[PDB]
Design a protein around this ligand. Sequence first.
Ligand SMILES: CCNC(=O)[C@H]1O[C@@H](n2cnc3c(N)nc(NCCc4ccc(CCC(=O)O)cc4)nc32)[C@H](O)[C@@H]1O
Length: 310
Amino acid sequence: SSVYITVELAIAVLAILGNVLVCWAVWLNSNLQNVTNYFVVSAAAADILVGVLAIPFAIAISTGFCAACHGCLFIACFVLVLTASSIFSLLAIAIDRYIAIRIPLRYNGLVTGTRAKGIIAICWVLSFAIGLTPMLGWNNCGQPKEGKAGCGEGQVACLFEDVVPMNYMVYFNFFACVLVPLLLMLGVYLRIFLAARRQLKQMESQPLPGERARSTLQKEVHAAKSLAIIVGLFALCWLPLHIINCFTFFCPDCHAPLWLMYLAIVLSHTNSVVNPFIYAYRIREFRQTFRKIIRSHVLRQQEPFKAAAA
Ligand SMILES: CCNC(=O)[C@H]1O[C@@H](n2cnc3c(N)nc(NCCc4ccc(CCC(=O)O)cc4)nc32)[C@H](O)[C@@H]1O
């Protein structure tokens, strides 16, 4: 459906705009320049690449244009590399927040700029490795479906499920790229929520009653509700599609309809617009820099059209 195409491109636009806004905001505002926001900006940079490249490629993965088998496989693998990078760098934000809340005394000496650049280098090496695995031999290109070839000789209708094996999708891709990060981000959230709960408990003993503690609680509560949003949206966005993959593979009896496939693919991509944008938006310092960039842009654009009194 062209309804799928337009929704897909609408999301691609929002993915670029929101995340460019996050990258501009960190580049302009001096106060936003800390190690946490290197992770935020890396997730944002990975989201831009999803919007600019991965989403267009994922549309071609549905249109079924005629291509060589491995060339079609190449396009599908690149979707996987670019989406994985967006997941792994989002996970880095979560891990950074965990170390901030659990070990606040040692955070600065521990999460240094050199180490942060190392963590995101690993994210890409991970995304390349998992995403390009089907290219090294784990593919369906041994038996190209030539019945559908009206394609030329040695060409196939370029479909994801045609070229990418479902045992790779379920055993490797779903496990490594969705479930494990989701389980870890959930783990991180539960611990951050726990710390905040225990903190409030010990303030109720009121030995001070507390003002150093008062802000600590506010930090932990803020971090708790931010990570609830990250994880909740991540699960809402990525689980439906991958469960369908487990549906298709683990249950060869029972297949999902076409409209449902598109909806799930679209949902998978919308994680790139909301994560980590909503996390960023939730910080007041991000929100006020957003307002300044937007308002400045609108005023610089509208001023030539604004007539003086005479
Ligand atoms: C790292 C995580 N990456 C991903 O999950 C990314 O890969 C892609 N994807 C992961 N599973 C899948 C998946 N089952 N089908 C697709 N498209 C194919 C759509 C489709 C296939 C077959 C048929 C029936 C054939 C016919 O009779 O006409 C119709 C539509 N893309 C995926 C997504 O773009 C995601 O963002």
